[PDB]
Amino acid sequence: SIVTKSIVNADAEARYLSPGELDRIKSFVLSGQRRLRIAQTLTENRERIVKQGGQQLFQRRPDVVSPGGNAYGEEMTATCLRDLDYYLRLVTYGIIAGDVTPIEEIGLVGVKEMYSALGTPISGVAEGIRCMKDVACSLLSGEDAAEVGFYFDYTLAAMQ
Amino acid sequence: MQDAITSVINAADVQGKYLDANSVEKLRGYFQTGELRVRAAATIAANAATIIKEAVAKSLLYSDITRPGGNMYTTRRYAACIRDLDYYLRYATYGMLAGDPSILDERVLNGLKETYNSLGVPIGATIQAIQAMKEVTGSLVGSDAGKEMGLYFDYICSGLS
Amino acid sequence: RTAYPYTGSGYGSAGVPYGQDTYGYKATTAKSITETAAQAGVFNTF
Amino acid sequence: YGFSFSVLESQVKNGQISIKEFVRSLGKSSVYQKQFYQPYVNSRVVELA
Amino acid sequence: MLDAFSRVVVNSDAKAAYVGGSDLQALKSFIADGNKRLDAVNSIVSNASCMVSDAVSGMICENPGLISPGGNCYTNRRMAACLRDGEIILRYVSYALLAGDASVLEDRCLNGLKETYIALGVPTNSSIRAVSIMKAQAVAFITNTATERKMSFAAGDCTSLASEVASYFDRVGAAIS
Amino acid sequence: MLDAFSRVVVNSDAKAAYVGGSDLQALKSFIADGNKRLDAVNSIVSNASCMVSDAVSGMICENPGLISPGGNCYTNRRMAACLRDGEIILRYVSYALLAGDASVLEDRCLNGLKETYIALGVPTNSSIRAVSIMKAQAVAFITNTATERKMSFAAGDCTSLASEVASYFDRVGAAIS
Amino acid sequence: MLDAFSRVVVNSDAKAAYVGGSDLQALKSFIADGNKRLDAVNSIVSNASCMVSDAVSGMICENPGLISPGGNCYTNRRMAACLRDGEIILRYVSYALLAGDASVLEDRCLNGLKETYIALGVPTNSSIRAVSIMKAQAVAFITNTATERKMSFAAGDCTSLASEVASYFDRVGAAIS
Amino acid sequence: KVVDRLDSQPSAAFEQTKQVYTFSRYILGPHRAVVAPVAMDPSEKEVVLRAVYRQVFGNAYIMEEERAELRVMESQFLLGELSVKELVRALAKSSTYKVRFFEGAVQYRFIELCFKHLLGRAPDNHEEIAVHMRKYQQEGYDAEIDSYLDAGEYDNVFGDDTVPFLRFRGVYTPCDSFNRQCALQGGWANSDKAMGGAALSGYNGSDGRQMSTMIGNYISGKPIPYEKVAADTPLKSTAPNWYARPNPALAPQPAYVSAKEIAELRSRVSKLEAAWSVAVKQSAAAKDTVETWRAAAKEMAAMRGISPMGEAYFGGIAQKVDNGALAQLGNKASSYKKYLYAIETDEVSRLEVDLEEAKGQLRVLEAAMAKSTPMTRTAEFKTLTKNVAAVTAAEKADPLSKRPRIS
Amino acid sequence: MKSVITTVVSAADAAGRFPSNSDLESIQGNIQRSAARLEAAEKLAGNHEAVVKEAGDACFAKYAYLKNPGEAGENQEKINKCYRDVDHYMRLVNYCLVVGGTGPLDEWGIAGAREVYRTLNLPTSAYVASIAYTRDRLCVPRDMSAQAGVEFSAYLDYLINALS
Numbered sequence A: 001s002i003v004t005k006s007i008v009n010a011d012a013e014a015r016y017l018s019p020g021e022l023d024r025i026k027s028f029v030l031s032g033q034r035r036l037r038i039a040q041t042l043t044e045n046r047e048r049i050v051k052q053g054g055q056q057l058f059q060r061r062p063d064v065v066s067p068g069g070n071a072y073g074e075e076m077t078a079t080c081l082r083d084l085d086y087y088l089r090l091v092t093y094g095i096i097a098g099d100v101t102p103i104e105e106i107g108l109v110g111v112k113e114m115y116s117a118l119g120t121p122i123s124g125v126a127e128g129i130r131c132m133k134d135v136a137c138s139l140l141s142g143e144d145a146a147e148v149g150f151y152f153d154y155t156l157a158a159m160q
Numbered sequence B: 001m002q003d004a005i006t007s008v009i010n011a012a013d014v015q016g017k018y019l020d021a022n023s024v025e026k027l028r029g030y031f032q033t034g035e036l037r038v039r040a041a042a043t044i045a046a047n048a049a050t051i052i053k054e055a056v057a058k059s060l061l062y063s064d065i066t067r068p069g070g071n072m073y074t075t076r077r078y079a080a081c082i083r084d085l086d087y088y089l090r091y092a093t094y095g096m097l098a099g100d101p102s103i104l105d106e107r108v109l110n111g112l113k114e115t116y117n118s119l120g121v122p123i124g125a126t127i128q129a130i131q132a133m134k135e136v137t138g139s140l141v142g143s144d145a146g147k148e149m150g151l152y153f154d155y156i157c158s159g160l161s
Numbered sequence C: 001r002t003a004y005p006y007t008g009s010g011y012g013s014a015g016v017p018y019g020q021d022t023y024g025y026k027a028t029t030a031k032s033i034t035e036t037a038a039q040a041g042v043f044n045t046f
Numbered sequence D: 001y002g003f004s005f006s007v008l009e010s011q012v013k014n015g016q017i018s019i020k021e022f023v024r025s026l027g028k029s030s031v032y033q034k035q036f037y038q039p040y041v042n043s044r045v046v047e048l049a
Numbered sequence E, F, G: 001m002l003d004a005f006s007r008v009v010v011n012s013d014a015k016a017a018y019v020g021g022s023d024l025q026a027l028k029s030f031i032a033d034g035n036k037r038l039d040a041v042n043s044i045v046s047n048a049s050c051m052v053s054d055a056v057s058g059m060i061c062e063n064p065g066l067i068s069p070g071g072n073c074y075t076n077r078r079m080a081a082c083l084r085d086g087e088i089i090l091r092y093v094s095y096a097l098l099a100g101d102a103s104v105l106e107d108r109c110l111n112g113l114k115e116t117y118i119a120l121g122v123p124t125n126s127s128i129r130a131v132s133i134m135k136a137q138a139v140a141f142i143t144n145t146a147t148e149r150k151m152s153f154a155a156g157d158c159t160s161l162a163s164e165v166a167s168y169f170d171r172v173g174a175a176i177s
Numbered sequence H: 001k002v003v004d005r006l007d008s009q010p011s012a013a014f015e016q017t018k019q020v021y022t023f024s025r026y027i028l029g030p031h032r033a034v035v036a037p038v039a040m041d042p043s044e045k046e047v048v049l050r051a052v053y054r055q056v057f058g059n060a061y062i063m064e065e066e067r068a069e070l071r072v073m074e075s076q077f078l079l080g081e082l083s084v085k086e087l088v089r090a091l092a093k094s095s096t097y098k099v100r101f102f103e104g105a106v107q108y109r110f111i112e113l114c115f116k117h118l119l120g121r122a123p124d125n126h127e128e129i130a131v132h133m134r135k136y137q138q139e140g141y142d143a144e145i146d147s148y149l150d151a152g153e154y155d156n157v158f159g160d161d162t163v164p165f166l167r168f169r170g171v172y173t174p175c176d177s178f179n180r181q182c183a184l185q186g187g188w189a190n191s192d193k194a195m196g197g198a199a200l201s202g203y204n205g206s207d208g209r210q211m212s213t214m215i216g217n218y219i220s221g222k223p224i225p226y227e228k229v230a231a232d233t234p235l236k237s238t239a240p241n242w243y244a245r246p247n248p249a250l251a252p253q254p255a256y257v258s259a260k261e262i263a264e265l266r267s268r269v270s271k272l273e274a275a276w277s278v279a280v281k282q283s284a285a286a287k288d289t290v291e292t293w294r295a296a297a298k299e300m301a302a303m304r305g306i307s308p309m310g311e312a313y314f315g316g317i318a319q320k321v322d323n324g325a326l327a328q329l330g331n332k333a334s335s336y337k338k339y340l341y342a343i344e345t346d347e348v349s350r351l352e353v354d355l356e357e358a359k360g361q362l363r364v365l366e367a368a369m370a371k372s373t374p375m376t377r378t379a380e381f382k383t384l385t386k387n388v389a390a391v392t393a394a395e396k397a398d399p400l401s402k403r404p405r406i407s
Numbered sequence I: 001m002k003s004v005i006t007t008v009v010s011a012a013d014a015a016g017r018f019p020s021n022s023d024l025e026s027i028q029g030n031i032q033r034s035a036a037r038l039e040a041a042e043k044l045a046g047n048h049e050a051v052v053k054e055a056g057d058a059c060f061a062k063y064a065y066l067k068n069p070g071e072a073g074e075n076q077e078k079i080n081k082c083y084r085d086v087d088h089y090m091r092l093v094n095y096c097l098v099v100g101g102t103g104p105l106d107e108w109g110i111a112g113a114r115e116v117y118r119t120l121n122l123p124t125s126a127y128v129a130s131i132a133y134t135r136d137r138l139c140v141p142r143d144m145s146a147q148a149g150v151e152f153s154a155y156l157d158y159l160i161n162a163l164s
């Protein structure tokens, strides 16, 4: 979160928190009412955000679901959508934490080692998160879509 | 860190005697299998990622250590596994070439089971993974070479237990 | 909530510190061979 | 460059060795001496150390 | 009961494995000296009627209170049983040398022998010496260094079967201690 | 057993040949009569299988209420434990005869024996009969005045070892009284 | 073993009483719903060969390590053995529902099952999971709320016999824990 | 109906072994039938004679030098005019069965020896013995055994053709009838001269009393304690030699048990038992994260099925098909093998292994604290500051006695 | 474990004799025959995941009705257990070639199988369609040697004779 790494920043520097750090912990907690509303929208829209998320993913990447693709059959396609439910969950954590620190140490650190070791095309799962982003930002206003989309594209950046 | 030749020289040196017929008798036995070990270490270097991918999918891929709460849930924790399994398949390759498991306890076994208990890593699932990794290694290098590479896997599993 | 929790800090942590007691590499507490036996009070002739 | 010392990040993240141990092993590594030891002189290597 | 083939089966069932190329080199080397093992059992069972009188009477000349009255080799019925369990133990050790694993030793011979010898009042420390003279004889017969009868053999090393039969008598001497 | 006499250490890398800082003067003085003591413990432990069976059956045939049902030696677990404890007591006198002092006997064998035998209902008046037979048995064997068995010792004297070992048996016999 | 009539007879023979009219209001009510008890225990016995496979395999889907090599329900001997005591317990509970008294369960089925299952290495917490699935089924078949089979019954209430067969299943849970 | 009929009903027409003896411990070890053939070699007559002497004498040393009354009863059998039932009746009427198991035996020890020798089982209930007590005292011992082997028990489960054996019959009519069985037939070593203690009470091993244990278990309903049914035990002799993950064989009892080791072990087995009851309610539905999308990822993946081998050409390459039952669901070899690796990777099974492993370590550590007053302790632990107090002054538990002097 | 050792030390132990020349001669057969039957234990181990894959789908190609609801192979989890069981029967045949007899089959797979397949309503004819497909997929000098194909098949149709 912004609270924990604004601390560990000033922790390492042998000092307390500046006004630049304490006027933002202050500014973040007054932002906390609006963050829970945004995460509350994505919380009980996972049925559509995931299922329509895998909608565009297969239309854009039919190789991964075609015979020979990693997510082929009734089995892998279920797990094919399971990971999108994971990453959609971590974005709800990042929105409430005000940072990608929850998304950092979960689903991002060493993610290329996992998916390379699973045979999954890491570029394909990046395409899946982008398809979820258009569904997510379509569910919110412009002021919110600059945030909810904002955490997806960070996940897109670290996932390639 | 001794190979079969280093261990033979040490025991023959530690009594201050020369290399008699019994010391050279084992050394000739090691040189006979010298051709087998390199080809065994050859294919294992080639299929390092494929062997580890086969072991985890065959032993602990879908068990509930893989699911939330299990010991392998987060991506950092999953990525630590294949990093961790790489050492077992790698150091076992060194023991297979050196013909002596001294390198394992020198560089792998000591402080290992005492470390997994600290992190809370399940030793039971770890040995199963190495056992499954031993099973696929016998596929590649053959039977007798698998017997050689397999002889150091369970050495890790025994001491890690 | 899973029983075999783990160690570490930051996100992806189970609420238990690293090493179960915040020590990664624990200094040992055992004595050597002959005075682990000396404390036992049974290996006296040994 | 995608370099990796997985063994050293192992033994330092667990606390099995210090940062000073992790720093010394980095210095005696071969990716170091290929970088800051081979292309230079023992004179210049001392200052870069 | 198990043998040396099916000990590595139930070890390979413990790791849900097939018996692949790693474990068969342990067993093809076991049948490589399979002619050596049968040359080692044949040295035991050919002197087995004489080894049991050699070993029980060696226990008597060390601990002569057994044949003292009130002892445990005094009554002549009670002497004839002590010649019997000298050779039932040698029957089950020779099965364990034959099978290559000490399961039949540790499920039929030693299965309750400790509470047998307490409840018969048999001295246990003299049962160690009845067993361990047969350990020192069988490692003399298998290495063919018995000091009054040499058997004919194709020459070569045999010291692994000597320590294998010494490992089966220590399994007996620890289970009844 | 092996702490009862001291052994000199002559080789290097020991920490006791050089930085020993002592020689054990109390036990360097007990090999000044050491062969006569070692024959005396050999006179006991070569008859220790027969001395315990004679003494336990000695108090049975003088007080016959113990093998009566309701007595403390009727069942098989109690009869095996009574033959075990006389054997343990005869070993611990044979430590104290060997080491030359009763300090091994009073803490490993006698410390907490009178509280044990009243916690199990063991008749204390009959168990002191069982060690007075073994007091009378051991002075026959050390002085070589046993009626049915002699042993070929050297030519000499072994009183003040027989009265040494008779001073341990009542030291047992008053520690349980 | 007893039944519901002969339970109050030994209750009345403890004070040597005749079986009077104040006692018999339970037993005259017992035969008043004696049609319901046969109508209840028919529904368990007509589904008993699928009640065990619903339950032992329902233990498997909760604890899937039992079918792994090592778990106590792995080998086809062990699964046929675990299915065998799945229907021994279901036989005696249906006996106990029929007699209306738990005496036939506790001297013939459960007397010493706990010490038996310790000796075979059977995990005692998983057998409660086999029993509690059969507890939830016998209260479902009696009240006819089974979600894939309804049987024909006369209209009326039945939850007393659902409670009685529930108390005969927690006796199995309390006996082996 | 998993078992159609027990062993006490005879095997009907269509089996060589009864149904309970197939999947019990009958097939593993040496407690089988060695039924005599019609005409046989005198070596094969010696095989059926040696099993009778093992069974009806119970591993006793029969002392083949004498065989005094035996060789008349042998020669009636070697002719063939004596049945194996009539041989095992005639051996139970001799003097060398009387001087072993009757002249020194209590009438509880004698009845429990005739159940092991003549029949297979143990005595089940109390009034089963009380028939055979009252049948001996009014008719005598020669009319006891004649009224003991000619009931409905022996002629069905052995007939007049086979020798008796230990009847591992699967269905045990009390559950303690398996417990007293394995406590009587005590392993492959122990004989009944040893088990009844007839040698140690004997005057030079002769004419001693054959006293009995387990008399408290036949009077009251009380089970056998588990150490007599797991250590000196025929289940160790007909052992499957599995990989049993809770190992049923008990550890030998340790010297120097401490109360500090037990008091954390009892808290550990309460920790796992309280954590097992939480985790088993969440099993198989909420522990499967891929389960929630199986209703959609199974119907998203039902598009453009391929009937022969070859299609999904995908722009003109091969990329074919597998079309089996497994790989139409996309599964692999690592997908059915994931059930075999469910001991170290499971969570509910992760608790139940260490529950029964540490309870089995508890039940031999707590039972090793039956030795109190002269026992030399030790301190193998590093004498840490963790210590429970000795606060046992007043009532803390107090099991409910509402009838304190109710009169 | 019914093997060549555990018949000559089970019959000698019931007789009370030492292992004579009749029983040392029986283990001389355990040196000549075991050169071939371990080769069929090694080829089956190194290729086990492709044999059961080629055999387990012949259970469902022959009996296609198992994927109907209410039947035995109705969902994903029950299909994976059906491929698991043919991996079990192919594992005990690998255990029986390396023991020397039918020991791991008569104790671990066969005994009690007719009581679990009737209780759980599994068709036992579907099991022998998978094993008899494996016996007829066996090319004798291509899969293994000529003699190792005799040893591997003779435990296979023994398992067929057990289930039918």
Ligand SMILES: C=CC1=C(C)[C@@H](Cc2[nH]c(/C=C3N=C(/C=C4\NC(=O)[C@H](C)[C@H]4CC)C(C)=C\3CCC(=O)O)c(CCC(=O)O)c2C)NC1=O
Residues within 6 Å of the ligand: E056, E066, E072, E073, E077, E078, E079, E081, E082, E083, E084, E085, E086, E088, E089, E108, E109, E113, E116, E120, E122, E123, E126, E127, E130, H059, H060, H061, H188, H189, H190, H191, H192, H193, H194, H198, H199, H202, H205, H206
């Ligand atoms: C299958 C496992 C198996 C064995 C290992 C043996 C051992 C054995 N021996 C005896 C029985 C006996 N065993 C001994 C033996 C000895 N006493 C000594 O002082 C010596 C140390 C030792 C001989 C070497 C004696 C003396 C008896 C006789 C007891 C008696 O007759 O009362 C018994 C009780 C049998 C009985 O009397 O009914 C058993 C089980 N027999 C077996 O069936």
Ligand SMILES: C=CC1=C(C)[C@@H](Cc2[nH]c(/C=C3N=C(/C=C4\NC(=O)[C@H](C)[C@H]4CC)C(C)=C\3CCC(=O)O)c(CCC(=O)O)c2C)NC1=O
Residues within 6 Å of the ligand: E047, E050, E051, E053, E054, E055, E057, E058, E059, E060, E061, E062, E133, E136, E137, E140, E141, E145, E146, E147, E148, E149
């Ligand atoms: C006081 C009485 C007394 C004895 C009777 C002997 C008995 C005896 N012999 C051996 C030692 C041995 N005992 C035998 C036995 C025999 N030799 C054969 O050739 C026959 C097969 C069989 C006699 C029939 C063998 C083979 C050895 C090994 C060495 C050898 O003799 O070649 C040992 C073990 C080693 C030892 O402790 O010394 C003992 C106690 N020693 C004694 O102290």
Ligand SMILES: C=CC1=C(C)[C@@H](Cc2[nH]c(/C=C3N=C(/C=C4\NC(=O)[C@H](C)[C@H]4CC)C(C)=C\3CCC(=O)O)c(CCC(=O)O)c2C)NC1=O
Residues within 6 Å of the ligand: E032, E033, E034, E035, E036, E038, E039, E040, E042, E142, E143, E144, E153, E154, E155, E156, E157, E158, E161, I021, I024, I025, I026, I027, I028
């Ligand atoms: C049916 C009964 C039966 C047997 C009795 C054995 C018989 C036997 N022994 C060996 C053969 C041998 N036996 C030995 C054993 C020994 N040599 C020594 O110097 C030691 C004293 C002893 C070790 C215990 C050795 C070293 C060989 C030769 C190497 C070998 O063949 O393994 C051989 C192979 C050579 C030959 O053709 O003779 C045979 C058949 N095998 C059987 O099938």
Ligand SMILES: C=CC1=C(C)[C@@H](Cc2[nH]c(/C=C3N=C(/C=C4\NC(=O)[C@H](C)[C@H]4CC)C(C)=C\3CCC(=O)O)c(CCC(=O)O)c2C)NC1=O
Residues within 6 Å of the ligand: F056, F066, F072, F073, F077, F078, F079, F081, F082, F083, F085, F086, F088, F089, F108, F109, F113, F116, F120, F122, F123, F126, F127, F130, H371, H374, H375
């Ligand atoms: C190191 C020293 C040392 C000892 C001296 C013994 C002392 C001793 N004896 C017994 C235990 C016993 N001791 C006896 C012995 C006897 N009761 C009699 O009536 C006879 C007079 C006498 C035999 C000579 C009996 C019968 C028991 C068992 C008590 C019972 O089970 O009721 C116990 C209880 C634990 C056990 O069962 O062993 C102990 C500590 N043990 C030791 O560790």
Ligand SMILES: C=CC1=C(C)[C@@H](Cc2[nH]c(/C=C3N=C(/C=C4\NC(=O)[C@H](C)[C@H]4CC)C(C)=C\3CCC(=O)O)c(CCC(=O)O)c2C)NC1=O
Residues within 6 Å of the ligand: E065, E068, E069, E070, E071, F047, F050, F051, F054, F055, F057, F058, F059, F061, F062, F132, F133, F136, F137, F140, F141, F145, F146, F147, F148, F149
């Ligand atoms: C009522 C039944 C009854 C018995 C069972 C015996 C038992 C017995 N023996 C001795 C007394 C003795 N007991 C022995 C013991 C032995 N002698 C030997 O040669 C053997 C090696 C060993 C027995 C196995 C010895 C050496 C003596 C001393 C007397 C002597 O010199 O023999 C004493 C003590 C006598 C005394 O204190 O003065 C008793 C009670 N006596 C009995 O009255």
Ligand SMILES: C=CC1=C(C)[C@@H](Cc2[nH]c(/C=C3N=C(/C=C4\NC(=O)[C@H](C)[C@H]4CC)C(C)=C\3CCC(=O)O)c(CCC(=O)O)c2C)NC1=O
Residues within 6 Å of the ligand: G056, G066, G071, G072, G073, G077, G078, G079, G081, G082, G083, G084, G085, G086, G088, G089, G108, G109, G113, G116, G120, G122, G123, G126, G127, G130, H024, H025, H168, H169, H170, H171, H172, H173, H174, H175, H178, H240
């Ligand atoms: C008269 C009353 C009576 C009973 C209540 C039952 C219970 C019972 N089960 C078994 C025997 C067994 N019981 C089990 C049972 C189980 N393993 C599990 O993991 C599950 C939790 C559980 C089944 C649901 C197993 C696996 C065996 C066989 C163990 C073996 O063969 O070694 C035995 C020993 C019999 C034998 O193996 O020969 C008995 C007495 N049988 C009876 O006769």
Ligand SMILES: C=CC1=C(C)[C@@H](Cc2[nH]c(/C=C3N=C(/C=C4\NC(=O)[C@H](C)[C@H]4CC)C(C)=C\3CCC(=O)O)c(CCC(=O)O)c2C)NC1=O
Residues within 6 Å of the ligand: G047, G050, G051, G053, G054, G055, G057, G058, G060, G061, G062, G133, G136, G137, G140, G141, G145, G146, G147, G148, G149, H284
């Ligand atoms: C992991 C796999 C798995 C199973 C096998 C079942 C096992 C199972 N069944 C029931 C619950 C039940 N189980 C049955 C049993 C049956 N139904 C019938 O009609 C037949 C007679 C018999 C199957 C052959 C019945 C009758 C109920 C009561 C509810 C009902 O089904 O109508 C319960 C308790 C409540 C519940 O959780 O549903 C469980 C655990 N559940 C599982 O999660």
Ligand SMILES: C=CC1=C(C)[C@@H](Cc2[nH]c(/C=C3N=C(/C=C4\NC(=O)[C@H](C)[C@H]4CC)C(C)=C\3CCC(=O)O)c(CCC(=O)O)c2C)NC1=O
Residues within 6 Å of the ligand: G032, G033, G034, G035, G036, G038, G039, G040, G042, G142, G143, G144, G153, G154, G155, G156, G157, G158, G161
């Ligand atoms: C030989 C076998 C045999 C039987 C199977 C029963 C058959 C049976 N059941 C009931 C009759 C009944 N049975 C029930 C029981 C139930 N109804 C429900 O709604 C519940 C689901 C279930 C309770 C568990 C009820 C409520 C009646 C009507 C009241 C009664 O007659 O007891 C009756 C009396 C009315 C009639 O004649 O139909 C009979 C004969 N009796 C027998 O002799």
Ligand SMILES: C=CC1=C(C)[C@@H](Cc2[nH]c(/C=C3N=C(/C=C4\NC(=O)[C@H](C)[C@H]4CC)C(C)=C\3CCC(=O)O)c(CCC(=O)O)c2C)NC1=O
Residues within 6 Å of the ligand: I043, I044, I045, I047, I050, I051, I054, I134, I137, I138, I139, I140, I142, I143
């Ligand atoms: C350990 C045991 C073991 C075996 C028994 C074989 C069994 C076997 N053979 C083939 C595969 C094959 N098997 C054959 C052989 C033949 N085809 C025929 O119709 C003729 C009867 C026979 C000629 C000798 C051929 C030609 C193929 C490849 C094409 C095919 O599947 O038929 C396959 C499919 C996988 C593969 O391609 O290899 C399997 C499992 N492999 C093994 O690992």
Ligand SMILES: C=CC1=C(C)[C@@H](Cc2[nH]c(/C=C3N=C(/C=C4\NC(=O)[C@H](C)[C@H]4CC)C(C)=C\3CCC(=O)O)c(CCC(=O)O)c2C)NC1=O
Residues within 6 Å of the ligand: G057, G060, G067, G074, G075, G076, G079, I059, I066, I072, I073, I074, I078, I079, I081, I082, I083, I085, I086, I088, I089, I108, I109, I116, I120, I122, I123, I126, I127
């Ligand atoms: C030791 C060796 C060994 C075996 C031989 C098997 C035998 C076996 N199979 C199953 C269990 C099963 N076996 C099948 C198998 C089949 N059903 C089908 O659709 C096909 C006809 C067939 C596969 C081709 C199914 C579907 C189940 C699950 C039954 C159920 O859940 O109802 C079970 C019950 C426990 C479980 O696994 O869930 C057992 C013991 N398991 C073993 O451990």
Ligand SMILES: CCC1=C(C)/C(=C/C2=NC(=C\c3[nH]c(/C=C4\NC(=O)[C@H](C)[C@H]4CC)c(C)c3CCC(=O)O)/C(CCC(=O)O)=C2C)NC1=O
Residues within 6 Å of the ligand: A064, A065, A069, A070, A071, A072, A076, A077, A079, A080, A081, A083, A084, A086, A087, A106, A107, A108, A118, A120, A121, A124, A125, A128, B057, B061, B062, B066, B067, B073, B074, B075, B078
């Ligand atoms: C919270 C962060 C996080 C992630 C992301 C994660 C992923 C993860 N993905 C897995 C499998 C898988 N993942 C896929 C995924 C895909 N196939 C495709 O074609 C697509 C490109 C892609 C999805 C959009 C497939 C097919 C498998 C099964 C692979 C196999 O069975 O071999 C598995 C192994 C099975 C399991 O335990 O679920 C893990 C652990 N774990 C985590 O903790």
Ligand SMILES: CCC1=C(C)/C(=C/C2=NC(=C\c3[nH]c(/C=C4\NC(=O)[C@H](C)[C@H]4CC)c(C)c3CCC(=O)O)/C(CCC(=O)O)=C2C)NC1=O
Residues within 6 Å of the ligand: B065, B071, B072, B076, B077, B078, B080, B081, B082, B084, B085, B087, B107, B108, B109, B112, B115, B119, B121, B122, B123, B125, B126, B129, C006, C007, C008, D007, D009, D010, D011, D013, D014, D016
């Ligand atoms: C060369 C000898 C050697 C070994 C073996 C070694 C192991 C080692 N394994 C570690 C962690 C780990 N190891 C695992 C492993 C597993 N999880 C499971 O479920 C499986 C059973 C298992 C894979 C087989 C996991 C998940 C972690 C991360 C733990 C955490 O973040 O708390 C760590 C902590 C630091 C790090 O990974 O950076 C070390 C030091 N170090 C060494 O020097």
